[PDB]
Design a protein around this ligand. Structure first.
Ligand SMILES: CC(=O)N[C@@H]1[C@@H](O)[C@@H](O)[C@@H](CO)O[C@H]1O
Ligand SMILES: CC(=O)N[C@@H]1[C@@H](O)[C@@H](O)[C@@H](CO)O[C@H]1O
Ligand SMILES: CC(=O)N[C@@H]1[C@@H](O)[C@@H](O)[C@@H](CO)O[C@H]1O
Ligand SMILES: [Ca+2]
Ligand SMILES: [Ca+2]
Ligand SMILES: [Ca+2]
Ligand code: NI
Lengths: 253, 254, 253
């Protein structure tokens, strides 16, 4: 329940994993997910953990996401099939993948004390990053671990801007009375994957007041993934020579 | 090949992370999972022409994870290149938000393959919008061994910058004179776009005098580059414009 | 330094890596990062390089990113622990991951001449792409390499469009004198990860002039990750019957 609603990054295959060294080809980051278990009857499939080949304070596993995330928690766990585990570690991270930073200026975070009991560390403040790395500092037996990172869910948007949708000069809004429209079909440069929402706002106004009142409007109608109808309008006795608008359409997920 | 023309081949294009339940050993891993992967047939040490599991039961899987949502059209399954092992039926599971997972067809079996090399495409009953997708073998011949591909619609990526409150100043130069008149306010984006953006630039504050009952006001970008643009406020005819304010939305694609 | 300020993709775990073949499970792309070094006293952790299984002109390593990048440079390096290196190679790439292209129309790019001296190749023109591949053409000893790709920093945005925030008909701005506001609170469909910037622009105007002057405005106040206050206003003697606006809110990184 503590990590309820959060994204399990490794379990969802949301990150690339790079390690400093691997003991051999069956002790790699392929075997790093929290609660990873393998065939206990066969030795050939290796460790229930990522295990390094060099045992020093310079090893690490780094998880990289191309989409920034808010990291709430890192969970550590020992090796499932042997008495090896990381007792403390530091966390480093980068948001822009140019400059790196250290959590708590590099101070240790409390790890685990056995093979299987997970220890969650909720960061003192949530970390905004693309890439994050566990750097083992002290260990029992060997530098061997399983892990997970828990992030807020991400949302993804795609936006298209289109400029200068125009009624034309001396348009139909410039004669008659009551509610009047000039409809201009608009087609997006590319079709959205899901239905967009559309903002559509004025950039050029050429209109005549009526008993001192300005009455002008622009609104999308019949929004699809492919485009929409830009509806310019006026009402009452107003005469409107022209209206121009820019649009911003955004689809989510 | 024709049936998936124009679709993105995820594994071929290295567009997903692959995680497996188990790997037989270090030369039977997801590194060997791509459709039509072939290796050195004269040397045994490079392993299988397939991902092969370690535990042989109904709880195995390969998960493909994408950080950017995709419309999955099809999954292609193929047997192992170098030995008589293949998956004969499987289920598909997926997640869009990476919090809740769902089973395609409520977990009903999907038809797999019947030999080493003949690909069997499954186009999903309805295309699936997802970030992560998993193949869960249900029945097999010999061992749990496969090569696979996922086909998605091409994705488009945009990057957007909003800037607020580009302003003429009070009692600006548009508030005197006749004919077409402009006040130009250079705008620099917070960061340089990778490619040329398109720019929406629209009013949020208007302070103007009509001219024989006509309002005449405009704002338009000029000289748009990846670094910024010129915000041109204007009026025309005999109109006097005290001030105009605008916000901008600039978006670059791909 | 020639690559200062650029993102090191492999170092930052920003790409998936697929290879044509791997010599065995300790000669894989897990060992491919520039300057990768392993345990030199133990043979079991394999090569300081990705090494192919098949030695021909058809091998490759592909780096894939879901987020388009601007590729500035590819760095090649030999194998750290043996006299094997790639002397020339070609580059191929794809932006849409459907159509692929060859750099220099397939012509050779100069590789390396020893184990450890890095040779940077800055592309004739930067390449905009999602996926990129090194294809060895000639080699010493075996097809064995370490590498890096250097890209411009990327920025990520998330955008929400909200339509039709409205004062109501015959709103409070339609009476009185002096600066007057009507405040409409707005909650975004979802909470942004970081503080957004907000564009808020007119789509319907219904107002009276005052001694021929139009005076109208709309502005966000108290923007948070969760929403903002939409402030519609007028001033002086103007009477405004109604105003309507659409918003566009974007958060970076
Ligand atoms: C139905 C109609 O035209 N209603 C208008 C209203 O929009 C507003 O302009 C008001 C100003 O006092 O005048 C009304 O006549
Ligand atoms: C060149 C010029 O000023 N053209 C204006 C036109 O924009 C519009 O306002 C029209 C209204 O009847 O009047 C014209 O004088
Ligand atoms: C404090 C105030 O109302 N200032 C207004 C100014 O905004 C502008 O409209 C100008 C038009 O000449 O008139 C001034 O009275
Ligand atoms: Ca415009
Ligand atoms: Ca504004
Ligand atoms: Ca609207
Ligand atoms: Ni990966």
């Amino acid at each position: 329940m503590s990590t309820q609603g959060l994204v399990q990054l490794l379990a969802n295959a949301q990150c690339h994993l790079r390690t400093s060294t691997n003991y051999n080809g069956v002790h790699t980051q392929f075997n790093s997910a929290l609660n990873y278990k393998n065939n206990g009857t066969n030795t050939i499939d290796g460790s229930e953990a990522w295990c390094s080949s060099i045992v020093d304070t310079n090893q690490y596993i780094v998880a990289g996401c191309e989409v920034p995330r808010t990291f709430m928690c890192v969970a550590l766990q020992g090796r499932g099939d042997a008495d090896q585990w990381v007792t403390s570690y530091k966390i480093r991270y980068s948001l822009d993948n140019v400059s790196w930073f250290e959590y708590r200026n590099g101070a240790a975070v409390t790890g685990v004390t056995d093979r299987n009991t997970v220890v969650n560390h909720f960061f003192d403040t949530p970390i905004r990053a693309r890439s994050i790395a566990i750097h083992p500092l002290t260990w029992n037996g060997h530098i061997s671990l399983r892990c997970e990172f828990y992030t807020q869910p991400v949302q993804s948007s795609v936006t298209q801007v289109g400029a200068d949708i125009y009624t034309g000069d001396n348009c139909a809004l410039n004669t008659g009375s009551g509610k009047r429209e000039v409809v201009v079909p608009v087609k997006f440069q590319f079709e959205f994957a899901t239905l967009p929402k559309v903002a559509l706002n004025f950039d050029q106004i050429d209109c005549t007041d009526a008993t001192n009142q300005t009455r002008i409007g622009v609104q999308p109608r019949n929004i699809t993934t492919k485009g929409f109808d830009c509806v310019f309008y006026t009402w009452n006795e107003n005469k409107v020579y022209s209206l121009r608008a820019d649009y911003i359409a955004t689809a989510l997920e």
